[PDB]
mmCIF file of all heavy atoms in Angstrom:
data_model
loop_
_atom_site.group_PDB
_atom_site.id
_atom_site.type_symbol
_atom_site.label_atom_id
_atom_site.label_comp_id
_atom_site.label_asym_id
_atom_site.label_seq_id
_atom_site.Cartn_x
_atom_site.Cartn_y
_atom_site.Cartn_z
ATOM 1 N N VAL A 65 100.898 102.975 84.317
ATOM 2 C CA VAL A 65 100.060 102.187 85.263
ATOM 3 C C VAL A 65 98.795 101.780 84.531
ATOM 4 O O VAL A 65 97.988 102.653 84.162
ATOM 5 C CB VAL A 65 99.753 102.919 86.569
ATOM 6 C CG1 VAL A 65 98.777 102.110 87.446
ATOM 7 C CG2 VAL A 65 101.024 103.263 87.310
ATOM 8 N N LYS A 66 98.681 100.482 84.286
ATOM 9 C CA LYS A 66 97.479 99.855 83.722
ATOM 10 C C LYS A 66 96.598 99.318 84.844
ATOM 11 O O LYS A 66 97.066 98.496 85.681
ATOM 12 C CB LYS A 66 97.816 98.769 82.702
ATOM 13 C CG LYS A 66 98.651 99.287 81.541
ATOM 14 C CD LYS A 66 98.933 98.170 80.553
ATOM 15 C CE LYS A 66 99.775 98.611 79.387
ATOM 16 N NZ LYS A 66 99.657 97.614 78.292
ATOM 17 N N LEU A 67 95.334 99.703 84.781
ATOM 18 C CA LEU A 67 94.274 99.275 85.713
ATOM 19 C C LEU A 67 93.274 98.413 84.972
ATOM 20 O O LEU A 67 92.737 98.861 83.938
ATOM 21 C CB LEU A 67 93.570 100.481 86.314
ATOM 22 C CG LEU A 67 94.432 101.479 87.049
ATOM 23 C CD1 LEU A 67 93.568 102.590 87.649
ATOM 24 C CD2 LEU A 67 95.287 100.798 88.102
ATOM 25 N N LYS A 68 92.960 97.246 85.506
ATOM 26 C CA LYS A 68 91.965 96.389 84.825
ATOM 27 C C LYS A 68 90.991 95.837 85.859
ATOM 28 O O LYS A 68 91.433 95.345 86.901
ATOM 29 C CB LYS A 68 92.645 95.237 84.081
ATOM 30 C CG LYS A 68 93.573 95.600 82.926
ATOM 31 C CD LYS A 68 94.200 94.331 82.298
ATOM 32 C CE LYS A 68 94.706 94.484 80.874
ATOM 33 N NZ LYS A 68 95.852 95.427 80.772
ATOM 34 N N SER A 69 89.707 95.962 85.565
ATOM 35 C CA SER A 69 88.622 95.296 86.296
ATOM 36 C C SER A 69 87.973 94.352 85.298
ATOM 37 O O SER A 69 88.426 94.278 84.155
ATOM 38 C CB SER A 69 87.674 96.279 86.877
ATOM 39 O OG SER A 69 86.958 96.949 85.846
ATOM 40 N N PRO A 70 87.002 93.520 85.714
ATOM 41 C CA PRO A 70 86.450 92.523 84.795
ATOM 42 C C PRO A 70 85.938 93.136 83.475
ATOM 43 O O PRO A 70 86.134 92.527 82.443
ATOM 44 C CB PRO A 70 85.363 91.880 85.666
ATOM 45 C CG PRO A 70 85.945 91.965 87.067
ATOM 46 C CD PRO A 70 86.500 93.375 87.094
ATOM 47 N N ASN A 71 85.340 94.321 83.516
ATOM 48 C CA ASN A 71 84.603 94.892 82.360
ATOM 49 C C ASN A 71 85.298 96.115 81.780
ATOM 50 O O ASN A 71 84.757 96.677 80.807
ATOM 51 C CB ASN A 71 83.203 95.332 82.758
ATOM 52 C CG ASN A 71 82.406 94.194 83.348
ATOM 53 O OD1 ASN A 71 82.464 93.069 82.840
ATOM 54 N ND2 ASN A 71 81.733 94.469 84.454
ATOM 55 N N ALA A 72 86.399 96.571 82.375
ATOM 56 C CA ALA A 72 86.919 97.913 82.084
ATOM 57 C C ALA A 72 88.425 97.948 82.304
ATOM 58 O O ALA A 72 89.020 97.057 82.997
ATOM 59 C CB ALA A 72 86.172 98.972 82.860
ATOM 60 N N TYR A 73 89.040 98.923 81.664
ATOM 61 C CA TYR A 73 90.480 99.183 81.837
ATOM 62 C C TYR A 73 90.730 100.687 81.766
ATOM 63 O O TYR A 73 89.917 101.493 81.234
ATOM 64 C CB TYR A 73 91.279 98.404 80.789
ATOM 65 C CG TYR A 73 91.083 98.913 79.381
ATOM 66 C CD1 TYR A 73 91.821 99.963 78.879
ATOM 67 C CD2 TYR A 73 90.140 98.328 78.560
ATOM 68 C CE1 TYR A 73 91.630 100.431 77.580
ATOM 69 C CE2 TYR A 73 89.929 98.783 77.258
ATOM 70 C CZ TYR A 73 90.664 99.848 76.780
ATOM 71 O OH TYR A 73 90.410 100.280 75.509
ATOM 72 N N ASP A 74 91.855 101.086 82.330
ATOM 73 C CA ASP A 74 92.358 102.458 82.177
ATOM 74 C C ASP A 74 93.875 102.414 82.238
ATOM 75 O O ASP A 74 94.468 101.369 82.574
ATOM 76 C CB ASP A 74 91.722 103.397 83.208
ATOM 77 C CG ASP A 74 91.671 104.865 82.790
ATOM 78 O OD1 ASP A 74 92.364 105.243 81.813
ATOM 79 O OD2 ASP A 74 90.983 105.639 83.472
ATOM 80 N N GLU A 75 94.488 103.514 81.857
ATOM 81 C CA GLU A 75 95.949 103.626 81.751
ATOM 82 C C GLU A 75 96.308 105.040 82.193
ATOM 83 O O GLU A 75 95.674 106.017 81.695
ATOM 84 C CB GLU A 75 96.400 103.334 80.315
ATOM 85 C CG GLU A 75 97.878 103.513 80.115
ATOM 86 C CD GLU A 75 98.397 102.880 78.821
ATOM 87 O OE1 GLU A 75 98.140 101.675 78.601
ATOM 88 O OE2 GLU A 75 98.999 103.612 78.010
ATOM 89 N N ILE A 76 97.263 105.116 83.108
ATOM 90 C CA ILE A 76 97.815 106.377 83.669
ATOM 91 C C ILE A 76 99.277 106.439 83.300
ATOM 92 O O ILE A 76 100.001 105.479 83.521
ATOM 93 C CB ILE A 76 97.638 106.446 85.200
ATOM 94 C CG1 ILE A 76 96.285 105.917 85.684
ATOM 95 C CG2 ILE A 76 97.940 107.864 85.672
ATOM 96 C CD1 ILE A 76 95.127 106.330 84.864
ATOM 97 N N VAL A 77 99.752 107.574 82.818
ATOM 98 C CA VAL A 77 101.199 107.715 82.603
ATOM 99 C C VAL A 77 101.726 108.827 83.513
ATOM 100 O O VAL A 77 101.209 109.921 83.515
ATOM 101 C CB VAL A 77 101.529 107.974 81.127
ATOM 102 C CG1 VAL A 77 103.034 108.126 80.956
ATOM 103 C CG2 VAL A 77 100.963 106.900 80.217
ATOM 104 N N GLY A 78 102.742 108.504 84.289
ATOM 105 C CA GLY A 78 103.471 109.433 85.149
ATOM 106 C C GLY A 78 104.948 109.190 84.969
ATOM 107 O O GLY A 78 105.328 108.519 83.988
ATOM 108 N N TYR A 79 105.750 109.750 85.843
ATOM 109 C CA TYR A 79 107.194 109.937 85.624
ATOM 110 C C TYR A 79 107.982 109.516 86.849
ATOM 111 O O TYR A 79 107.523 109.692 87.992
ATOM 112 C CB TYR A 79 107.450 111.364 85.097
ATOM 113 C CG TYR A 79 106.658 111.537 83.827
ATOM 114 C CD1 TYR A 79 105.385 112.069 83.853
ATOM 115 C CD2 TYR A 79 107.129 111.011 82.636
ATOM 116 C CE1 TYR A 79 104.616 112.151 82.706
ATOM 117 C CE2 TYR A 79 106.360 111.045 81.486
ATOM 118 C CZ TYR A 79 105.112 111.636 81.517
ATOM 119 O OH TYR A 79 104.366 111.659 80.372
ATOM 120 N N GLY A 80 109.152 108.960 86.582
ATOM 121 C CA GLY A 80 110.155 108.709 87.620
ATOM 122 C C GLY A 80 110.840 109.979 88.095
ATOM 123 O O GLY A 80 110.671 111.035 87.448
ATOM 124 N N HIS A 81 111.633 109.854 89.152
ATOM 125 C CA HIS A 81 112.448 110.948 89.751
ATOM 126 C C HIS A 81 113.499 110.333 90.675
ATOM 127 O O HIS A 81 113.200 109.344 91.364
ATOM 128 C CB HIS A 81 111.576 111.968 90.484
ATOM 129 C CG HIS A 81 112.260 113.271 90.715
ATOM 130 N ND1 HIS A 81 113.159 113.453 91.733
ATOM 131 C CD2 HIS A 81 112.170 114.457 90.071
ATOM 132 C CE1 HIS A 81 113.606 114.700 91.714
ATOM 133 N NE2 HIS A 81 113.015 115.337 90.699
ATOM 134 N N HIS A 82 114.692 110.925 90.730
ATOM 135 C CA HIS A 82 115.823 110.387 91.523
ATOM 136 C C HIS A 82 115.460 110.455 93.006
ATOM 137 O O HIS A 82 115.978 109.631 93.770
ATOM 138 C CB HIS A 82 117.127 111.118 91.137
ATOM 139 C CG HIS A 82 117.117 112.576 91.453
ATOM 140 N ND1 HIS A 82 116.595 113.523 90.584
ATOM 141 C CD2 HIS A 82 117.520 113.256 92.553
ATOM 142 C CE1 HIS A 82 116.698 114.722 91.125
ATOM 143 N NE2 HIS A 82 117.267 114.584 92.329
ATOM 144 N N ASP A 83 114.542 111.342 93.386
ATOM 145 C CA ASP A 83 114.126 111.562 94.798
ATOM 146 C C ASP A 83 113.073 110.540 95.282
ATOM 147 O O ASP A 83 112.818 110.513 96.493
ATOM 148 C CB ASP A 83 113.596 112.983 94.984
ATOM 149 C CG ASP A 83 114.710 114.026 95.130
ATOM 150 O OD1 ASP A 83 115.838 113.628 95.470
ATOM 151 O OD2 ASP A 83 114.435 115.210 94.893
ATOM 152 N N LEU A 84 112.477 109.713 94.413
ATOM 153 C CA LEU A 84 111.542 108.655 94.895
ATOM 154 C C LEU A 84 112.281 107.706 95.844
ATOM 155 O O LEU A 84 113.377 107.245 95.477
ATOM 156 C CB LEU A 84 110.997 107.873 93.696
ATOM 157 C CG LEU A 84 110.090 108.658 92.750
ATOM 158 C CD1 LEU A 84 109.657 107.784 91.584
ATOM 159 C CD2 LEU A 84 108.892 109.247 93.467
ATOM 160 N N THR A 85 111.670 107.342 96.978
ATOM 161 C CA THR A 85 112.235 106.380 97.951
ATOM 162 C C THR A 85 111.435 105.060 97.995
ATOM 163 O O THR A 85 112.017 104.054 98.427
ATOM 164 C CB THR A 85 112.354 107.056 99.319
ATOM 165 O OG1 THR A 85 111.046 107.409 99.768
ATOM 166 C CG2 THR A 85 113.241 108.289 99.268
ATOM 167 N N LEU A 86 110.164 105.021 97.558
ATOM 168 C CA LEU A 86 109.454 103.733 97.274
ATOM 169 C C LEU A 86 109.523 102.785 98.477
ATOM 170 O O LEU A 86 109.774 101.585 98.253
ATOM 171 C CB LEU A 86 110.157 103.054 96.102
ATOM 172 C CG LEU A 86 110.367 103.945 94.894
ATOM 173 C CD1 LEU A 86 111.161 103.234 93.811
ATOM 174 C CD2 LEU A 86 109.027 104.392 94.381
ATOM 175 N N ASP A 87 109.309 103.288 99.682
ATOM 176 C CA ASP A 87 109.595 102.462 100.881
ATOM 177 C C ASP A 87 108.468 102.521 101.916
ATOM 178 O O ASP A 87 108.652 101.874 102.972
ATOM 179 C CB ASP A 87 110.973 102.798 101.454
ATOM 180 C CG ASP A 87 111.162 104.251 101.794
ATOM 181 O OD1 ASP A 87 110.329 105.079 101.374
ATOM 182 O OD2 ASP A 87 112.147 104.548 102.475
ATOM 183 N N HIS A 88 107.325 103.144 101.638
ATOM 184 C CA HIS A 88 106.166 103.002 102.548
ATOM 185 C C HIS A 88 105.716 101.537 102.568
ATOM 186 O O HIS A 88 105.616 100.870 101.541
ATOM 187 C CB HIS A 88 105.018 103.944 102.186
ATOM 188 C CG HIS A 88 104.065 104.085 103.320
ATOM 189 N ND1 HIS A 88 103.017 103.198 103.497
ATOM 190 C CD2 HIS A 88 104.053 104.925 104.382
ATOM 191 C CE1 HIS A 88 102.360 103.540 104.601
ATOM 192 N NE2 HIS A 88 102.976 104.599 105.162
ATOM 193 N N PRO A 89 105.402 100.967 103.743
ATOM 194 C CA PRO A 89 105.033 99.555 103.811
ATOM 195 C C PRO A 89 103.596 99.195 103.400
ATOM 196 O O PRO A 89 103.353 98.019 103.235
ATOM 197 C CB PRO A 89 105.218 99.199 105.303
ATOM 198 C CG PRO A 89 105.094 100.519 106.026
ATOM 199 C CD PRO A 89 105.570 101.590 105.062
ATOM 200 N N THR A 90 102.684 100.156 103.286
ATOM 201 C CA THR A 90 101.227 99.843 103.124
ATOM 202 C C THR A 90 100.567 100.629 101.962
ATOM 203 O O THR A 90 99.601 100.095 101.417
ATOM 204 C CB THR A 90 100.459 99.956 104.458
ATOM 205 O OG1 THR A 90 100.223 101.308 104.806
ATOM 206 C CG2 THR A 90 101.171 99.295 105.616
ATOM 207 N N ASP A 91 101.063 101.800 101.553
ATOM 208 C CA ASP A 91 100.309 102.691 100.634
ATOM 209 C C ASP A 91 101.126 102.948 99.369
ATOM 210 O O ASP A 91 102.380 102.926 99.417
ATOM 211 C CB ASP A 91 99.997 104.038 101.271
ATOM 212 C CG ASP A 91 99.086 103.975 102.475
ATOM 213 O OD1 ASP A 91 98.345 102.972 102.608
ATOM 214 O OD2 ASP A 91 99.112 104.952 103.247
ATOM 215 N N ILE A 92 100.429 103.145 98.254
ATOM 216 C CA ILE A 92 101.083 103.484 96.962
ATOM 217 C C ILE A 92 100.227 104.563 96.342
ATOM 218 O O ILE A 92 99.024 104.291 96.124
ATOM 219 C CB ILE A 92 101.186 102.274 96.021
ATOM 220 C CG1 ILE A 92 102.008 101.118 96.619
ATOM 221 C CG2 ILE A 92 101.760 102.748 94.688
ATOM 222 C CD1 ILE A 92 102.003 99.873 95.774
ATOM 223 N N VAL A 93 100.830 105.719 96.109
ATOM 224 C CA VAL A 93 100.166 106.957 95.629
ATOM 225 C C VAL A 93 100.776 107.399 94.299
ATOM 226 O O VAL A 93 101.995 107.564 94.192
ATOM 227 C CB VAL A 93 100.288 108.057 96.706
ATOM 228 C CG1 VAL A 93 99.645 109.325 96.191
ATOM 229 C CG2 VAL A 93 99.658 107.606 98.026
ATOM 230 N N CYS A 94 99.917 107.621 93.304
ATOM 231 C CA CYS A 94 100.317 108.221 92.013
ATOM 232 C C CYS A 94 99.878 109.668 92.061
ATOM 233 O O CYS A 94 98.710 109.851 92.419
ATOM 234 C CB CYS A 94 99.644 107.486 90.868
ATOM 235 S SG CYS A 94 100.328 105.810 90.695
ATOM 236 N N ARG A 95 100.763 110.616 91.743
ATOM 237 C CA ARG A 95 100.440 112.061 91.930
ATOM 238 C C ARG A 95 100.517 112.838 90.618
ATOM 239 O O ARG A 95 101.385 112.551 89.789
ATOM 240 C CB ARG A 95 101.429 112.717 92.890
ATOM 241 C CG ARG A 95 101.607 111.998 94.206
ATOM 242 C CD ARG A 95 102.570 112.774 95.080
ATOM 243 N NE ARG A 95 102.592 112.261 96.423
ATOM 244 C CZ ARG A 95 101.677 112.471 97.365
ATOM 245 N NH1 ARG A 95 100.546 113.139 97.148
ATOM 246 N NH2 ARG A 95 101.856 111.890 98.530
ATOM 247 N N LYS A 96 99.617 113.802 90.473
ATOM 248 C CA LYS A 96 99.679 114.819 89.406
ATOM 249 C C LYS A 96 100.769 115.853 89.719
ATOM 250 O O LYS A 96 101.386 116.295 88.791
ATOM 251 C CB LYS A 96 98.321 115.497 89.262
ATOM 252 C CG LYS A 96 97.330 114.730 88.412
ATOM 253 C CD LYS A 96 96.028 115.480 88.280
ATOM 254 C CE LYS A 96 95.352 115.231 86.957
ATOM 255 N NZ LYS A 96 95.839 116.182 85.934
ATOM 256 N N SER A 97 101.006 116.227 90.983
ATOM 257 C CA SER A 97 102.089 117.172 91.350
ATOM 258 C C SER A 97 103.451 116.474 91.239
ATOM 259 O O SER A 97 103.494 115.288 90.824
ATOM 260 C CB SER A 97 101.868 117.742 92.713
ATOM 261 O OG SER A 97 102.065 116.744 93.694
ATOM 262 N N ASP A 98 104.528 117.203 91.559
ATOM 263 C CA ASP A 98 105.912 116.674 91.659
ATOM 264 C C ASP A 98 106.273 116.486 93.140
ATOM 265 O O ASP A 98 107.446 116.300 93.445
ATOM 266 C CB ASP A 98 106.896 117.596 90.928
ATOM 267 C CG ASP A 98 106.935 119.034 91.440
ATOM 268 O OD1 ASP A 98 106.160 119.362 92.376
ATOM 269 O OD2 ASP A 98 107.743 119.819 90.898
ATOM 270 N N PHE A 99 105.293 116.497 94.035
ATOM 271 C CA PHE A 99 105.508 116.238 95.473
ATOM 272 C C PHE A 99 105.952 114.790 95.647
ATOM 273 O O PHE A 99 105.369 113.914 94.991
ATOM 274 C CB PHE A 99 104.238 116.526 96.256
ATOM 275 C CG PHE A 99 104.399 116.287 97.724
ATOM 276 C CD1 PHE A 99 105.115 117.177 98.505
ATOM 277 C CD2 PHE A 99 103.854 115.167 98.325
ATOM 278 C CE1 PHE A 99 105.255 116.953 99.867
ATOM 279 C CE2 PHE A 99 103.986 114.953 99.684
ATOM 280 C CZ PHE A 99 104.705 115.838 100.453
ATOM 281 N N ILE A 100 106.979 114.556 96.459
ATOM 282 C CA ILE A 100 107.524 113.195 96.680
ATOM 283 C C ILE A 100 107.548 112.891 98.178
ATOM 284 O O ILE A 100 108.101 113.700 98.957
ATOM 285 C CB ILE A 100 108.907 113.063 96.032
ATOM 286 C CG1 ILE A 100 108.795 112.995 94.512
ATOM 287 C CG2 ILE A 100 109.634 111.865 96.606
ATOM 288 C CD1 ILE A 100 110.103 113.056 93.796
#
């Protein structure tokens, strides 16, 4: 996940999982835990 604002950038690396459902209509959460 690359984040860019006008003056700055950051990069987050996380992991896929077969249990992800990716189907909430409004929110997107990146987690340090393995909670899905």
Side-chain angles (χ1 to χ4, degrees):
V65 175
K66 302 181 181 197
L67 303 183
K68 296 179 158 65
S69 68
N71 303 318
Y73 69 85
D74 206 346
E75 176 165 307
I76 320 318
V77 180
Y79 302 93
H81 198 280
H82 64 274
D83 280 340
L84 293 178
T85 63
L86 309 176
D87 56 347
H88 197 273
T90 77
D91 296 338
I92 300 174
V93 178
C94 291
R95 308 182 170 283
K96 277 182 148 273
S97 70
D98 59 358
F99 180 74
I100 287 172

